[PDB]
Amino acid sequence: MISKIDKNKVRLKRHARVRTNLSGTAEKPRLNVYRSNKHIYAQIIDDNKGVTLAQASSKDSDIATTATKVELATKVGEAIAKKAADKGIKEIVFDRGGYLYHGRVKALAEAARESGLEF
Amino acid sequence: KFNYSSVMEVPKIDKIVVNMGVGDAVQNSKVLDNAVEELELITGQKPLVTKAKKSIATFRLREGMPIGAKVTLRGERMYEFLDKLISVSLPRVRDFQGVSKKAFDNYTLGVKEQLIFPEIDYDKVSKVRGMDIVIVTTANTDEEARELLANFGMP
Amino acid sequence: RVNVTLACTECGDRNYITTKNKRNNPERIEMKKYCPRLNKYTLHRET
Amino acid sequence: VSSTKNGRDSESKRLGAKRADGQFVTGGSILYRQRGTKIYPGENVGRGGDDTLFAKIDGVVKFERKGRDKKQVSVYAVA
Amino acid sequence: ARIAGVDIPREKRVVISLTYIYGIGTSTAQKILEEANVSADTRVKDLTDDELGRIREVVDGYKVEGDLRRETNLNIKRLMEISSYRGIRHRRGLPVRGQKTKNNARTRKGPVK
Amino acid sequence: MLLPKRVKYRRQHRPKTTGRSKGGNYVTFGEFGLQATTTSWITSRQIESARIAMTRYMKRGGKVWIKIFPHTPYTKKPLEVRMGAGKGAVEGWIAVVKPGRILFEVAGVSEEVAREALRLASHKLPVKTKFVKREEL
RNA sequence: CUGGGGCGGUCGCCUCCUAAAAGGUAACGGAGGCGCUCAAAGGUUCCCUAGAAUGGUUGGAAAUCAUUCAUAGAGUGUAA
């Protein structure tokens, strides 16, 4: 009786392996992105200290809108872009958690690229 | 039916894996492709490199490190394969037994004692090839699996 | 396993020497090295 | 007429630690010479081609634990 | 074709297909098909479109069908158990008609030797 | 005649003889046994010589246990040649025994019969022994 | 060179034990190797992870497997 495997478990493992040579540090903070089966969350974290200074999700009250299930990501990326533009919108390291770079993440990743985020 | 507390604890049929045994192409240059087409003649899929020629797990003649073929069929193709297994695969067998352990290839202990390609009759075949079809199910018990082995299809 | 001298087309100097298997690759090796004098990744060829 | 066949041996490679803990070192100074990853590199500490631990910033050495059964050496800029 | 469901022999003698089929040992193979132009040139299903149909009508019209003949033959086994012969107490063991248990071994019925 | 089926190295370094017995200082198989009080090397020839002298007087009337087995082989240069030419060939197998280590163990026989059988096997051993019984206090 | 010389055997480099928890340390002390190979066995990006025993080739009791244990038991061009 072949048993199924958790999707978050494997993802976490992969994410940990990619976080062995990449971390935020004030000037260059890491942009962690959490993609669920409903919405997507993103927040600029500073590993050096260990405190967040940004927040953007697809389940936000100013983001919640019947889209095409991919347009939200674009808005999410532009939403945090302006928030990050207020203070600290220069060189930043983009973290793809543990998922692939192709898909909804790509749209959210390029969303800040066209916003001005030098990354 | 048998006291399932929810409508999701009912067992399912996990997968269906089968193809030819050795088909040793070290002296059978085209028999490899012939058996590949024979496996493609039951269900149309490219044949890969694995041991998918058993009735269950592994408990037969030893050797190891071979070079056979295998096929993965688990969707509505699997349902059609079972339909053809009740039509052409019960033309020559006509003998429903019962077991839930191992057979040909905790397994890894054999790769022999299989069928002889009965549905592949010599109407377009050059030989007979062991193609035992391992049964993969979501069965939590071998006797519950036997209850499903007679359920909806030949004992 | 013998020695190989990647000749240049403009440089004219053998400042790139490598090794290879004649039984493995009997054809002439052609890679893109960098000649300082020309200061440009040029296509070198084995003599 | 008894014979022998065990009189061959290679040279000894001075391995081990080269800097003590709490000692001031300058960037580029070797801290450890080993055959593998006996001690992992910490902060401001790179690994060489022969698995040699060296410092990149001038400061004091600090041997600490990394994980639960692995050691690591780091260097701090604070004089 | 549909003479036996799944044609065993292929591309060979036309009367060689009835040799693999049980019920005939090439003794009445050319005495069953008597249709017009019922020849054979080493081509069972080759160079032929309509010929098996008449062979399936003469095989069904004959006293023996093909499975009923073996049905009564496999039903007289217990019918010949009236303390007579027909290997009453021979098949059970190993000895067979001819008393070849002393001349040699039991080639007829022998589990392991 | 007791020796390992196979060993990684045929040349050891001679086991050290100091301190007390590491383990095996209590009888757990029979009721009576022979306990050593001195340190010395026990060869296989002596081990089998004492066992044959014990069973001979026991007339196959009990069970005997050997808690020692030659694990280290020792070499020896024959015909006393000049020193310095490499190690010699294996001569036999020995076993280091420290004070407080049980040697033999008898069971299923008279208490006075085991006291006489063990005394006969102690005359073929090069170490001072002592008769002891299963302790329980 | 050499537990007198001769005869034999050795003479350079690599790993372990002797070596006495830093490093170093001898004997004609105890064990093994090298005198290369590779155009991918290189670089970078990405993704993966043995042995037991039951549908039995009278069976090598390990066909190229189903999924339990794997918990790494493997695997690494080469000796440790």
- The CATH number given to whatever domain includes residue A62 is 3.30.420.100
Angle at B149 between CA B148 and CA B153, to 5 degrees: 100
Q: Do E and A share at least 3 CB pairs under 8 Å?
A: no
Kindly list the strands in the beta sheet with D39-41, ordered across the sheet, starting from the edge strand earlier in the chain: D24-25, D59-65, D71-76, D39-41
- Residue A40 has phi, psi (to 5 degrees) of -135, 135
Helix (H) or strand (E) holding F131: strand F129-133
Q: Is the CB of C9 under 7 A from strand G?
A: no
Alpha carbon distance B69, B77 (integer Å): 19
Q: Provide the token pair at E3.
A: 């003479």
Name the residue among A56, A54, A53, A24 with its Cα closest to residue A41: A56
Angle at A48 between CA A44 and CA A51, to 5 degrees: 45
**Residue pair F70/F3 in contact by the 8 Å Cβ criterion:** yes
Q: Is the CB of F83 under 7 A from strand G?
A: yes
Contacts of C26 (CB under 8 A, 6+ apart): none
- B2-31 residues near strand G (Cβ < 7 Å): 14-15, 17, 20-22
Alpha carbon distance F7, C26 (integer Å): 51
Helix, strand or coil for residue F30?
coil
Sign of the dihedral defined by the CA atoms of residues B71, B72, B74, B76, in that order = negative
Alpha carbon distance B60, B70 (integer Å): 18
**Residue pair F31/F108 in contact by the 8 Å Cβ criterion:** no
**Residue pair A108/A80 in contact by the 8 Å Cβ criterion:** no
**Residue pair F56/F29 in contact by the 8 Å Cβ criterion:** no
Residues in chain B: 155
Alpha carbon distance E6, B128 (integer Å): 14
* Residue A102 located in a structural domain: yes
Helix (H) or strand (E) holding F65: strand F63-66
CB atoms within 10 A of CB A96: 18
Alpha carbon distance A106, B83 (integer Å): 44
Helix, strand or coil for residue F47?
helix
Nucleotide nearest to D10 (CA to C1'): G14
Distance from chain centroid for Cα B113: 13
**Residue pair E80/E97 in contact by the 8 Å Cβ criterion:** no
**Residue pair A22/A93 in contact by the 8 Å Cβ criterion:** yes
> What letters, b where the CB count within 10 A reaches 16 and e where it falls short, cover C24-36?
eeeeeeeeeeebe
Q: For chain F, which residues lie within 8 Å of any Cβ of chain D, measuring from their own Cβ?
A: 81, 85-86
Task: Specify which residues A107 forms β-bridges with.
Answer: none
**Residue pair F60/F117 in contact by the 8 Å Cβ criterion:** no
* Residue A118 located in a structural domain: no
Cross-chain residue pair E5–B123, CB shorter than 8 Å: no
B66 in contact with E, Cβ within 8 Å = no
Contacts of F108 (CB under 8 A, 6+ apart): F61, F62, F63
CB under 8 Å, gap of 24 or more: what pairs does A40-49 form?
A40/A72, A40/A73, A40/A76, A40/A104, A40/A105, A40/A108, A42/A76, A42/A77, A42/A80, A42/A108, A43/A80, A44/A80, A44/A84, A44/A88, A44/A92, A47/A23, A48/A23, A48/A24
- For A12: left if phi > 0, alpha if psi spans -120 to 50, otherwise beta; the answer is alpha
CB atoms within 10 A of CB A116: 13
A5 in contact with B, Cβ within 8 Å = no
B93: which chain E residues are within 8 Å (Cβ-Cβ)?
none
For chain A, how many structural domains are there in total? 1
* Residue A9 located in a structural domain: no
Structure-determination technique: cryo-EM
Q: Provide the token pair at A60.
A: 């936000």
**Strand F129-133 to F32-36 pairing:** antiparallel
Name the residue among B126, B51, B134, B120 with its Cα closest to residue B89: B120
Cross-chain residue pair A1–B15, CB shorter than 8 Å: no
Rounded to 10 deg, the angle between the F111-121 and F44-58 helix axes is 150
Angle at E40 between CA E38 and CA E46, to 5 degrees: 105
Q: Is the CATH number 3.90.1170.10 carried by domain F23-137?
A: yes
**Residue pair F129/F53 in contact by the 8 Å Cβ criterion:** no
Helix, strand or coil for residue F124?
helix
Alpha carbon distance B64, B111 (integer Å): 8
Secondary structure of chain B as H, E, C letters: CCCCCCCCCCCCCCEEECCCCCCCCCCCCCHHHHHHHHHHHHCCCCCECCCCCCCCCCCCCCCCCCCCCECEECCHHHHHHHHHHHHCCCCCCCCCCCCCCCCCCCCCCCCCCCCCCCCCCCCCCCCCCCCCCEEECCCCCHHHHHHHHHCCCCC
Q: Provide the token pair at B4.
A: 């399932």
**Which chains neighbour D (Cβ–Cβ under 8 Å, 3 or more pairs)?**
F
Contacts of B120 (CB under 8 A, 6+ apart): B38, B41, B42, B128, B129, B131
- Residue A113 has phi, psi (to 5 degrees) of -65, -40
What are the boundaries of each domain within chain F? Answer: 23-137
Q: Mutate which of B107, B138, B142, B149 to disrupt the A interface (most A C-beta within 10 Å)?
A: B138
**Residue pair A22/A119 in contact by the 8 Å Cβ criterion:** no
Nucleotide nearest to A18 (CA to C1'): G46
Residue F20, burial from CB neighbour count under 10 angstroms (0-12, 13-18, 19+): exposed
Name the residue among F135, F99, F101, F106 with its Cα closest to residue F121: F106
* Residue position matching structure tokens 């017009």: E36
Residue B39, burial from CB neighbour count under 10 angstroms (0-12, 13-18, 19+): buried
Tell me what percent of chain D is helix, strand and coil, each rounded to the nearest 5.
Answer: 0, 40, 60
Alpha carbon distance D43, D61 (integer Å): 10
* Residue position matching structure tokens 């519950």: B144
Q: Provide the token pair at E63.
A: 């006293």
* Residue A74 located in a structural domain: yes
- B50-69 residues near strand G (Cβ < 7 Å): 50-69
Residue at minimum CA to C1' distance from nucleotide G32: D6
Helix (H) or strand (E) holding F45: helix F44-58
Helix (H) or strand (E) holding D62: strand D59-65
Structural domain of A83: 21-110
D6: which chain F residues are within 8 Å (Cβ-Cβ)?
86
B122: which chain E residues are within 8 Å (Cβ-Cβ)?
7-10
Q: Is the CB of B82 under 7 A from strand G?
A: no
> What letters, b where the CB count within 10 A reaches 16 and e where it falls short, cover A1-28?
eeeeeeeeeeeeeebeeeeeeeebeeee
Alpha carbon distance F63, F49 (integer Å): 17
* DSSP per-residue letters across A32-75: EEEE-SS-EEEEEEETTTTEE---EETTSTTT-----SSHHHHH
**Residue pair B50/B70 in contact by the 8 Å Cβ criterion:** yes
Helix (H) or strand (E) holding A78: helix A71-86
Q: Is the CB of B70 under 7 A from strand G?
A: yes
What are the boundaries of each domain within chain B? Answer: 1-155
> What letters, b where the CB count within 10 A reaches 16 and e where it falls short, cover E63-92?
eeeeeeeeeeeeeeeeeeeeeeeebeeeee
* Annotated resolution, angstroms: 2.9
